[PDB]
Design a protein around this ligand. Structure first.
Ligand SMILES: Cc1cc(OCCCc2c3n(c4c(-c5c(C)nn(C)c5C)c(Cl)ccc24)CCCN(c2cc(C(=O)O)cc4c2ccn4C)C3=O)cc(C)c1Cl
Length: 568
């Protein structure tokens, strides 16, 4: 009894409120900030009457009830909102799942005004905690699935930016680098976790659990299977409740798990020493991103247990999933150089066939030839990878981006230009990210990175679906989406996208934007021109892509009255 009380005491009050504010920002993305602040604190003082003691009349109820009522205080007015009030006409029965079902991944939130440095430092110094509450509210509301205890981590680092950069010498030169590193870092976190949650609620718990044993196994090659199984259990717990919106129990369970690891390193890894001296948010972040422990040296071949034996079909018949996770454990520990996804379908094949030959004429005889159908699976990325990286070094991140923009708009023209240019820009960022690395590192690095960018495409398209091929690749099976998409070709059913004038004109506003901003606009234009002209597309493209760059460059420095743009 007394849910709030329990978690309030384990999390402490600062990030109890921080968590609860995030929760509200992610459940009702279009509620102004002051209202959210009002709700968070009424929640909080209610919470400390309930810490005062259980028998608080209303203490004993569920977090889902309490948060629900506090948002169905206001979330009932429809003219300002939408079908949101309807979730308040319902009850905890389906009201909460109504709320989750209404989260939006590309909400239409107004821009984020960026004051100059002195403005921001003064507002920070006036009331710094209003400031940081602001920061949580805006990021959470645009990333309704952002992994929360990590967001406390970023909040910490962001306010450290303001505290030290506002007493330095040059506050700009200090701050803006830090903010842009922190912004890029933050978009990575959001996307990663957006893949986890998609895995969970579109593919069930055991898909994610497989993903977890694969990835912890590559990471902790020296732990016995019991240990890894335990951690995959508990971290599954954690992401189930961070994706289910149970943010206070997601966080508390994440702290608990960090406590446990930093208590059993000897039986876990050897690269935890450093991470197990940091404060308690950094702890989880670091632990989450620690490097791969070295693999143990003389590890038995796997044919011993998984091929040569014939207690394979009966060891399997008793506990199927424990035996497969055993397999994918051993395979995965033995291959830090395999992407998680590859190993997962290696276990999927190993299964599909154990399901077949544990019944066939002679199991061992027919299932003996299994590690042969691994080799195709294992080649197909490595080659695609080495092809794509040689292309990237041949063109640099930007022109790389432009190539894949033509590529993928021609596979999937129906999809909105914004999502095309976005998803592709990040695809381009794979190149700088991974091709630096040895050809062990490259394919875990790479293929696991394309799983998340492609899922980003998937959920952006899932909210306004227009291309059937996107849907089929995003739903068949999550482990084969990168191959699926790669396998795609030009869609010829399509027809020229008419021809509009104000699509292909640039406007004078652009001289005031940042170099990155200007690039994003000219690839917006480039996907507009493929949609309008999928026909003549070899050098003609690069030709007029370069022409648009040259054209704006000339007219921005035109000293004119904008007109150079208007006439060509
Ligand atoms: C985890 C994470 C951390 C993070 O960390 C960096 C924070 C991102 C961020 C920025 N700004 C924010 C404001 C904000 C507003 C509105 N008004 N005021 C006064 C403030 C302080 C709030 Cl309330 C909350 C967050 C931000 C300033 C506006 C846009 N922008 C900016 C954006 C750009 C640009 O993108 O072009 C250039 C910018 C600034 C700020 C200065 N320069 C040069 C930022 O860098 C960012 C992200 C996405 C993530 Cl996912």
């Amino acid at each position: 009894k007394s849910e709030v009380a329990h978690r309030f005491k384990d999390l402490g009050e600062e990030n109890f409120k921080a968590l609860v504010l995030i929760a509200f920002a992610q459940y009702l993305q279009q509620c102004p900030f002051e209202d959210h602040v009002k709700l968070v604190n009424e929640v909080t003082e209610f919470a400390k009457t309930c810490v005062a003691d259980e028998s608080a009349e209303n203490c004993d109820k569920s977090l889902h009830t309490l948060f629900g009522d506090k948002l169905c205080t206001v979330a009932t007015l429809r003219e300002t909102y939408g079908e949101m009030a309807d979730c308040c006409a319902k009850q905890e029965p389906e009201r909460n799942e109504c709320f989750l079902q209404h989260k939006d991944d590309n909400p239409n939130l107004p821009r984020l005004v960026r004051p100059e440095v002195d403005v921001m430092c003064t507002a920070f110094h006036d009331n710094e905690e209003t400031f940081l509450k602001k920061y949580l509210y805006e990021i959470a509301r645009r990333h309704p699935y952002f992994y929360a205890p990590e967001l406390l981590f970023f909040a910490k680092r962001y306010k450290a930016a303001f505290t030290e950069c506002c007493q330095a010498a040059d506050k700009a030169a200090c701050l803006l680098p830090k903010l842009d590193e922190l912004r890029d870092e933050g978009k990575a976190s959001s996307a990663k976790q957006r893949l986890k949650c998609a895995s969970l609620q579109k593919f069930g718990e055991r898909a994610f659990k497989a993903w977890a044993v694969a990835r912890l196994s590559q990471r902790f090659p020296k732990a016995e299977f019991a240990e890894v199984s335990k951690l995959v259990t508990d971290l599954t717990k954690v992401h189930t409740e961070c994706c289910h919106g149970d943010l206070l129990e997601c966080a508390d369970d994440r702290a608990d798990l960090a406590k446990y690891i930093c208590e059993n390193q000897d039986s876990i890894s050897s690269k935890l020493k450093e991470c197990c001296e940091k404060p308690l948010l950094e702890k989880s972040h670091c632990i989450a991103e620690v490097e791969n422990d070295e693999m143990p040296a003389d590890l038995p071949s796997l044919a011993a247990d998984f091929v040569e034996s014939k207690d394979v079909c009966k060891n399997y018949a008793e506990a199927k999933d424990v035996f497969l996770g055993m397999f994918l454990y051993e395979y995965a520990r033995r291959h830090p150089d395999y992407s998680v996804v590859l190993l997962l379908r290696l276990a999927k094949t190993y299964e599909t066939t154990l399901e077949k030959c544990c019944a066939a004429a002679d199991p061992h005889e027919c299932y003996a030839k299994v590690f042969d159908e691994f080799k195709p699976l294992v080649e197909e990325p490595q080659n695609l990878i080495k092809q794509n990286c040689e292309l990237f070094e041949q063109l640099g991140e930007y022109k790389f981006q432009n190539a894949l923009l033509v590529r993928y708009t021609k596979k999937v023209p129906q999809v909105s230009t914004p999502t095309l240019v976005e998803v592709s820009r990040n695809l381009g960022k794979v190149g700088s990210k991974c091709c630096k690395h040895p050809e062990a590192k490259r394919m875990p690095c790479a293929e696991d990175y394309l799983s998340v960018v492609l899922n980003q495409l998937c959920v952006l398209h899932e909210k306004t679906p227009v291309s059937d091929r996107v849907t089929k690749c995003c739903t068949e099976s999550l482990v084969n989406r990168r191959p699926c998409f790669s396998a795609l070709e030009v869609d010829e059913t399509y027809v020229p996208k008419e021809f509009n004038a104000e699509t292909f004109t640039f406007h004078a506003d652009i001289c005031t934007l940042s170099e990155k901003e200007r690039q994003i606009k000219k690839q917006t234009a480039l996907v507009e021109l493929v949609k309008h002209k999928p026909k003549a597309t070899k050098e003609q493209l690069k030709a007029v892509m370069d022409d648009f760059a040259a054209f704006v460059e000339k007219c921005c420095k035109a000293d004119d009255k904008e007109t150079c743009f208007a006439e060509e």
